[PDB]
Write an enzyme that holds these catalytic residues in place. Structure first.
Site, mmCIF file in Angstrom:
data_model
loop_
_atom_site.group_PDB
_atom_site.id
_atom_site.type_symbol
_atom_site.label_atom_id
_atom_site.label_comp_id
_atom_site.label_asym_id
_atom_site.label_seq_id
_atom_site.Cartn_x
_atom_site.Cartn_y
_atom_site.Cartn_z
ATOM 1 N N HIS A 40 0.318 -8.903 67.188
ATOM 2 C CA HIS A 40 1.213 -7.748 67.122
ATOM 3 C C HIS A 40 2.222 -7.757 68.268
ATOM 4 C CE1 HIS A 40 -1.823 -5.777 69.851
ATOM 5 N NE2 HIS A 40 -0.758 -5.156 70.322
ATOM 6 N N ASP A 84 -5.887 -10.605 64.809
ATOM 7 C CA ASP A 84 -4.783 -10.307 65.718
ATOM 8 C C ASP A 84 -4.749 -11.319 66.872
ATOM 9 O OD1 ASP A 84 -2.681 -9.032 66.938
ATOM 10 O OD2 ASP A 84 -3.845 -7.325 67.652
ATOM 11 N N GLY A 168 0.569 -1.804 77.212
ATOM 12 C CA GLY A 168 1.081 -2.729 78.206
ATOM 13 C C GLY A 168 0.097 -3.875 78.403
ATOM 14 N N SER A 170 -1.877 -5.231 75.720
ATOM 15 C CA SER A 170 -2.031 -6.045 74.509
ATOM 16 C C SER A 170 -1.787 -7.526 74.737
ATOM 17 C CB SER A 170 -1.085 -5.577 73.396
ATOM 18 O OG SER A 170 -1.662 -4.539 72.631
ATOM 19 N N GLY A 171 -2.635 -8.347 74.128
ATOM 20 C CA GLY A 171 -2.504 -9.785 74.245
ATOM 21 C C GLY A 171 -3.201 -10.340 75.466
#
Ligand SMILES: [Ca+2]
Lengths: 216, 57
Positions: A40, A84, A168, A170-171
């Site tokens: 995402h 994801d 902030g 994410s990932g």
């Protein structure tokens, strides 16, 4: 805020910041030419920043590299967030040192109860934040998110809330015993009771990652 | 104006930090908020221009 603490300068050398004008997601360096992050977090143009601590100041240890290829998992679902995960190939290899290093992929799936380290700038993001939290049993994850959890997801955090990853992050990485076990993905709010963060279960994608890097 | 223009901005469950525009009914103008990256609602625009055209009234 998040409920974490400021990480010690460069104590998380595999952590990267994805930037497209400003920091919008995190990621992890798995080899001198590839970064893994969340699907995402996709954007057509992405600059990867390594060796960062305070993303608002030029400290001198950072390396700025543009993404050459961005590959999302073919089965990523934008609605359910299943699968994801995304791979980013850098335009050129980065120089590995004490502040820029790789994190190992999982040798197997870590069992519930394993203590891990979650990092990100998710806080006006400024200094890299750290949080020590355990992988929660799948049953508790499912109970917190009725009918929303797939086997490619794992919850990490506390059922009482108080500490959690947030916008902030994410990932970003969830590392347990030196291996990348999770990728910051989603959750309802941040640090709320009965709603711990949900993360992509990396151990289910080791072959996909290795096969993809080999073919690209 | 459309009803979705009167709904508060929706960050969503994802944890990215993406700056988007939303129509603030109480201020009669478009402002920015933090979008998480997934499951966006209609009061979410990539630019002030699109936000005003759609929700300006
Ligand atoms: Ca810096």
């Amino acid at each position: 805020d998040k409920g974490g603490y400021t990480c010690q300068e460069n104590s998380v050398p595999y952590q990267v910041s994805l930037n497209s004008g400003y920091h919008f997601c995190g990621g992890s360096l798995i080899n001198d030419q590839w970064v893994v992050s969340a699907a995402h977090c996709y954007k057509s143009r992405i600059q990867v920043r390594l060796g960062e601590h305070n993303i608002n100041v030029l400290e001198g240890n950072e390396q700025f590299v543009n993404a050459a290829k961005i590959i999302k998992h073919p089965n990523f679902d934008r609605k359910t967030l299943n699968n994801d995960i995304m791979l980013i190939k850098l335009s050129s290899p980065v120089k590995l040192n004490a502040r820029v290093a790789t994190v190992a992929l999982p040798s197997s799936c870590a069992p519930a109860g394993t203590q891990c380290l979650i990092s990100g700038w998710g806080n006006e993001p400024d200094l890299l934040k750290c949080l020590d939290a355990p992988l929660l049993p799948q049953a508790d994850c499912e109970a917190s998110y009725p009918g929303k959890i797939t086997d490619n997801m794992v919850c990490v955090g506390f059922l009482e809330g108080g500490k959690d990853s947030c916008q902030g992050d994410s990932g970003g990485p969830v590392v347990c015993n030196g291996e990348l076990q999770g990728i910051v993905s989603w959750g309802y709010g941040c640090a709320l009771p009965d709603n711990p963060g949900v993360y992509t279960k990396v151990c289910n994608y080791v072959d996909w990652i290795q096969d993809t890097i080999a073919a690209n | 104006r459309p009803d979705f223009c009167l709904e508060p901005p929706y960050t969503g469950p994802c944890k990215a930090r993406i700056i988007r525009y939303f129509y603030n009914a109480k201020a009669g103008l478009c402002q920015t908020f933090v979008y998480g990256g997934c499951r966006a609602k209609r009061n979410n625009f990539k630019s002030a221009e699109d936000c005003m055209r759609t929700c300006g009234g």
